[PDB]
Amino acid sequence: GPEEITADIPNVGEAALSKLDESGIVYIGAEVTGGDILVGKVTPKGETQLTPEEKLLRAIFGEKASDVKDSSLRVPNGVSGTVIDVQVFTRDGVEKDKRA
């Protein structure tokens, strides 16, 4: 299926997600150092089928349908600086996210 760009990345501590807005792209002016997150991306993978008990559980705890890898963009180590400009290109037929 299709990739997604989002802020809800599985298996990340809340610390690294202060510096992303709703759409999952860094602020303008935030200064980064090697190792942080720039864009939050998740890649769907295989959907194995299940039993009713975990359906009840995963509907109470309520988090997911398609347990999914993450492959976000990150600053290669040894680099630092101050983001100054973000650009977003979209096809003609994809719903435009808020920030574009």
Partner 1 sequence: PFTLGQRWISDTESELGLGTVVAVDARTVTLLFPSTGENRLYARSDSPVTRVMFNPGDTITSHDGWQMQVEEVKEENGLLTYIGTRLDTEESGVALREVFLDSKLVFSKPQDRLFAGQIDRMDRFALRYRARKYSSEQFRMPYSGLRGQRTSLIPHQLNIAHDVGRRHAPRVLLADEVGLGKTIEAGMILHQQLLSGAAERVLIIVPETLQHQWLVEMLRRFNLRFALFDDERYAEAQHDAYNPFDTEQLVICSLDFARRSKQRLEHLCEAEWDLLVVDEAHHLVWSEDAPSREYQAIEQLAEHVPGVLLLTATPEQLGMESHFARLRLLDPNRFHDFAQFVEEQKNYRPVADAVAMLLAGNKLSNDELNMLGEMIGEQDIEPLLQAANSDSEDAQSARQELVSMLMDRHGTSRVLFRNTRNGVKGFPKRELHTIKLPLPTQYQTAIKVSGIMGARKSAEDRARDMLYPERIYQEFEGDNATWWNFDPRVEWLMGYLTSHRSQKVLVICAKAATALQLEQVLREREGIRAAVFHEGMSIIERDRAAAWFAEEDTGAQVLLCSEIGSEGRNFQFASHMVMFDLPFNPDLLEQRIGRLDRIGQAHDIQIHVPYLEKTAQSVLVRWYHEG
CB of 1 to partner 1, least distance (A): 23
Q: What angle do CA 28, 31, 36 make, to 5 degrees?
A: 105
65 near partner 1, judged by CB under 8 A:
no
Positive or negative, the CA dihedral 21, 23, 28, 33 is: positive
Using CB under 8 A as the binding rule, whether residue 30 contacts partner 1 is answered as no
Length of the chain: 100
Q: Is 85 in the site for partner 1 (CB under 8 A)?
A: no
Contact residues for partner 1 (CB under 8 A)? 13-15, 18, 52-53, 56, 60-63
